[PDB]
Amino acid sequence: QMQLQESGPGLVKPSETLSLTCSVSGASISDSYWSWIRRSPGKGLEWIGYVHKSGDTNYSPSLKSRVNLSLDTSKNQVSLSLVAATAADSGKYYCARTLHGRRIYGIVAFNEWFTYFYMDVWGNGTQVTVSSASTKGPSVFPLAPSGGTAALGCLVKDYFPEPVTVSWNSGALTSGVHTFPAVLQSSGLYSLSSVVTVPSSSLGTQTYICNVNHKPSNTKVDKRVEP
């Protein structure tokens, strides 16, 4: 079987070149065609292009002006280069071994046939987020809440990098506390929510304060949350 893995050197800021590598194992790149695919949240699963040693190589009309696919025989790697990257180029990129066949529906001499390409081996894909994100402290907002239970929380918004810590009432309140993993936003900044489930009847008696700490920017915020 063959294995493929898509990877970047790292972080892509707007108006920088996106450089991706597809490491191939268990086979040589010279025996096959190769394709790059991507899934941008703004759009669907799109074919970027394919490459081959013979010079049989084509790119998507929408990306042809910015993309370069290359073959590195020495390193057995398939390369993707995308100039002038923006948030619109964010998403997940796939490398795949591409096969081909001929759909012959008439006489070959009459050009009554065409070549089709299909991908039988895909990589897991790598995520690419284009941004100028740098060290930034979080903004903290209260998430306000008859009978039954109630969910009150704190929205820790737009920080970088990970991670942040959250407690309630300086650790006096740990029951029903659920801190969710942060989302990586198109801005390149992170956001997470910490919600504590409490009895509605308690809304008057007890006082609720979330304690947020973000080391990278030396930020400490205590946000009181009420209804």
Binding site: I37, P41, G42, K43, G44, L45, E46, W47, S60, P61, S62, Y94, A96, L99, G101, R103, Y105, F114, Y116, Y118, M119, D120, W122, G123, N124, G125, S139, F141, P142, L143, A144, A151, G153, L155, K157, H178, F180, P181, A182, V183, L184, Q185, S186, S191, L192, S193, V195
Partner: protein, 206 residues
């Protein structure tokens, strides 16, 4: 999007009506997994793919590419895309379809959903965020859809991958970045969480 009971047969159509001779490929995409080739050249099957999966012939002209999966089983629960090659249509650079197949016979736990509106504090900062917190679901696969009033919203949506909770169920959160104007103008916003064929909805109004 379709839901099928184990043993029953699934039918997924993809792409436009056919104009010339075709070579249709079908691809399977499970959550957080590499896609796979299930069908190529309309009906042909790569090694490993069982005869349960079958494709439609490229005749007659005007047909729609249909993928049939008989006697469905849990493993066949995934997104199904087709890549159509038509002798009379220009080469396609975006894969078609995207239909999700849910299999119904599985052990599971429905998600709990809490939706928060933007805080008055954030609004004073001229920004707005809807927070949809999803917890206690199993298996760990959900799809989140947002509704501004009655119309779907694609822009502004950020959704985390499911993460394992301490009680071995799953959690996830979806955020809708929104301008205060968008927030006030609309009658309401909805977070729609679909899990194993069933959707749970929460709505907040400014």
């Amino acid at each position: 999007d379709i839901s099928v009971a184990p043993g029953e047969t699934a039918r997924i159509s993809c792409g436009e009506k056919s104009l010339g001779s075709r070579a249709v490929q079908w691809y399977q995409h499970r959550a957080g997994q590499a896609p796979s080739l299930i069908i190529y050249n309309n009906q042909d099957r790569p090694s490993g793919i069982p005869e349960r999966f079958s494709g439609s012939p490229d005749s007659p002209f005007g047909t729609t590419a249909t993928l049939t999966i008989t006697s469905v089983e849990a493993g066949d629960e995934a997104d199904y895309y087709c890549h159509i090659w038509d002798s009379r249509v220009p080469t396609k650079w975006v894969f078609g379809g995207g239909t999700t197949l849910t299999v119904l016979g599985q052990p599971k736990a429905a998600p709990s959903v809490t939706l928060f509106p933007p805080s008055s504090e954030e609004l004073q900062a001229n920004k707005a965020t809807l927070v949809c917190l999803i917890s206690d679901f199993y298996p760990g696969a959900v799809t989140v859809a947002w509704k501004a009033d009655s119309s779907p919203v694609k822009a502004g949506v950020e959704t985390t991958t499911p993460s394992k909770q301490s009680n071995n169920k799953y959690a996830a959160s979806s955020y809708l970045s929104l301008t205060p104007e968008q927030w006030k103008s609309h009658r309401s916003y909805s977070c729609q969480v679909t899990h194993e064929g069933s959707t749970v909805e929460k709505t907040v109004a400014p």
